[PDB]
Design a protein around this ligand. Sequence first.
Ligand SMILES: Nc1ncnc2c1ncn2[C@@H]1O[C@H](COP(=O)(O)OP(=O)(O)OP(O)(O)=S)[C@@H](O)[C@H]1O
Ligand SMILES: [Mg+2]
Length: 408
Amino acid sequence: MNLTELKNTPVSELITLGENMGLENLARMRKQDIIFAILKQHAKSGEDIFGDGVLEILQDGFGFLRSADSSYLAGPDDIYVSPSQIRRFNLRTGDTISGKIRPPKEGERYFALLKVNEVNFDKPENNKILFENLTPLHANSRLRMGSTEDLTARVLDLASPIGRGQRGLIVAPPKAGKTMLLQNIAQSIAYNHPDCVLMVLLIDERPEEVTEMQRLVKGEVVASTFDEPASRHVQVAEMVIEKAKRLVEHKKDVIILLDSITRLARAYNTVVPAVLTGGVDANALHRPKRFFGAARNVEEGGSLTIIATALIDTGSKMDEVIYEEFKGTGNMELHLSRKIAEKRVFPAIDYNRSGTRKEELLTTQEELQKMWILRKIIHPMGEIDAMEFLINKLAMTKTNDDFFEMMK
Ligand SMILES: Nc1ncnc2c1ncn2[C@@H]1O[C@H](COP(=O)(O)OP(=O)(O)OP(O)(O)=S)[C@@H](O)[C@H]1O
Ligand SMILES: [Mg+2]
């Protein structure tokens, strides 16, 4: 009946499902062939075959429905979308489409979208592109993030209040909680705000860190591994950034947690041809910024917030330039100290450095000035000295109870 349902169902059940349809000795062909031999077997004319995926409009004019469970990698069972079909529905890259499909004829190799049933979870007859939505500052509606796990999220909401559509930069040296901090936020996202579309974008990562991230996050984890070509890291990022844009057009609040705007920019640099300023062609930093530029609150409805990590102190001067450029382009930054972490001390947040632009719209005066008197007393406190102060002042309350009960 359904392609993605079939490839998800184990091979053993796939054999015993095909055999009941008169398919002989399926045990001697791969899972892939079995699925094709089953969906094709619905040659019982007028028997419905379905498929789903996220659309990628190719160069020539045609398109394909890429699958999320592959990080939108081009597979042998993508669903072909006609250049004529796109015209009939005004389709775009990032659109999530589903519906009736049919098997490849002779001379064909892929399934083709026979009938459109849904476009971005909306009826096909349904949108001004994110490219022209008006952009309020984004601070209007806040996103707060209780036990021991809520330790980081607590210091996080005090240091850098997040908003609906924040351009957030997470500065980090190696070994500082960079992963666990993101996994803490991603845990605080689905737990407190399930009404939001969470996407975690991992570029140039290790397959194990990818699968451990894929395991922990309630939401769509999309990733490209270290081995894959530079054009691949770009492809994954552009499939995702456009997917978000189409979802905000339907007035959704979308959150993207990018692993490394640093790693993504290294990729674009080698994909964008041809002017040098320290290894990186200065004209290549544009496309990574275009990605980072989408982060906004939309007045007419919805939002896109991108909290991306910036890698620093790696030993490559290129990695420094990437940071130098995106410095200030974000309306929220959170710094991790190499010392507050490597001294076996939790959230390596350098409090004084971390902050968000226009805190006032994200927080009422009673809740805002609460952070101001707090900052004033913490300001002159050292890097590691200031942190352990907050760890112990908070491990004795909830969060709001702090001024309410640490004033005497
Ligand atoms: N929220 C947290 N709670 C407890 N321990 C943490 C937290 N964040 C980081 N750590 C510790 O700090 C170390 C950091 O490792 P990761 O979570 O992989 O961070 P990372 O900075 O992304 O590491 P790299 O540079 O990718 S090898 C881990 O061994 C953890 O024990
Ligand atoms: Mg990491």
